[model samples]
Target: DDWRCARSMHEFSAKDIDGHMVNLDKYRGFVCIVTNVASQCGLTEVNYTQLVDLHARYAECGLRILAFPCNQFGKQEPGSNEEIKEFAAGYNVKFDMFSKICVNGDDAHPLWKWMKIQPKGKGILGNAIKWNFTKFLIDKNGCVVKRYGPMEEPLVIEKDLPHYF
Candidate 1:
């Protein structure tokens, strides 16, 4: 069974900043912004800022951002879970951030595996996230609806979000 709609969002869970277990169920009925992040990427600052803004702007309107620090690309994010939390907090990010998780290769996260199978841009690489800040926009219904590249800005997502609302 796939995570689709409010019912499906509850199917997973991840560790939070303090290493406490957090349930994905809490994000049901909200538009989810899931990103594969890296601390040393050139776009790190911009993407982090945009993500914080998005979380703040839509907090009242059912928007949730989930960021996972990954190290597959360039060995850029050489930080532990705690370090990643500090970096995100420095940017005023207040969304649901998880532990540093691998986004590619044999150890790629399961959630990402499901995302790659979503019906969007076809012929794209499977099983591996291309780069840092690769985003998956999950609709309020819990379906992974849109996939954006690292270069795409968060505001670009705002335009399509209204439809889901």
Candidate 2:
């Protein structure tokens, strides 16, 4: 069965790093950058640092970056929720960080299942996420605008910031 929802991303719900239930509805009118993150990956420092900087720069203007830790790739994010939180804290990450999730397979979060089918979600690698730090940029209307590969830096996304604002 297809789980695609073209209207908006408000149909999803997830647990935050602190185990608090987070409803995507609260972020309905915000431009969101949803990504799969890993703590020990080679790209961790650059990605995390850039993310924190992006958040600081655009958050007040309505950008919300949601990060989800995943261990599916190379077991890079093998820590518990608390550990993940601590690791992210070290990077001065201030955006929303959700619980660990599988971005592929049947057990994938419903949010991801929906995102993968969106037009922007398709990449050269197809719908499957290529690696850690792959990001999906959703507009304020909750529709996905584009998907960036693991190598795409957060600052690169800043170029499109004016359009969303």
Candidate 3:
């Protein structure tokens, strides 16, 4: 709680793939699934598939999947922003995809740092993202709802998303 300067996710901002400043406040009143993504990881296929499926299934109902590419884990996401964008395009990803960012350690983005300290679910490690595809679910009010580890899979979380909607 104290790790964040703002009470809600809306107070944060990040750059888009095109380097445009995006205000997180724009996503207010929407349920958000924030994740640290890696393009070349072994887990990429399942996570990306499920992520795209989730977006197609719940986007019209106010769900936003915010993916931030990160190479922090084994250099799995070594591509530039453009390459990452192209990689996502191959999956027909329709959700929000932001510029690459560090999701752990001292240089981690503030938004990610804030997310890490929020309440986690049964299987999550406290304040640490164990690997690529670590996910955080944010309620419409901007409160963190749960943290899902890399292997939690988007389809599994899909069942619980309606509660926030």
Identify the candidate with maximal lDDT.
Answer: 2
Give candidate 1 regions above 4 Å deviation. 1-9, 121-127
Off by over 4 Å in 2: none
Shift of residue 56 alpha carbon in model 2, Å: 0.7
Please list the C-alpha lDDT of all candidates, in the order they appear: 0.77, 0.90, 0.88
lDDT of 2 by residue, 37-83 (tens): 99989999999999999999999999999999999999999999999
Which scores better on TM-score, 1 or 2? 2
Q: How do the residues 22-141 of candidate 3 rate in per-residue lDDT, one tens digit apiece?
A: 999888999999999999999999999899999998999999999999999999999999999999999999999999999878889988888876665233446778899988889898
Error of 2 at 156 (Å): 0.8
Separate clash counts for every candidate: 1, 0, 0
Residue 30's lDDT in candidate 3: 97
Residue 8 CA displacement from its true place in model 1, Å:
3.9
Order of the predicted models by lDDT, top scorer first: 2, 3, 1
Please say which candidate is ahead in lDDT: 1 or 2.
2
**Which residue window of length 10 is worst by lDDT in model 2?**
1-10
Q: Give the TM-score of candidate 3.
A: 0.94
Model 3 score (lDDT): 0.88
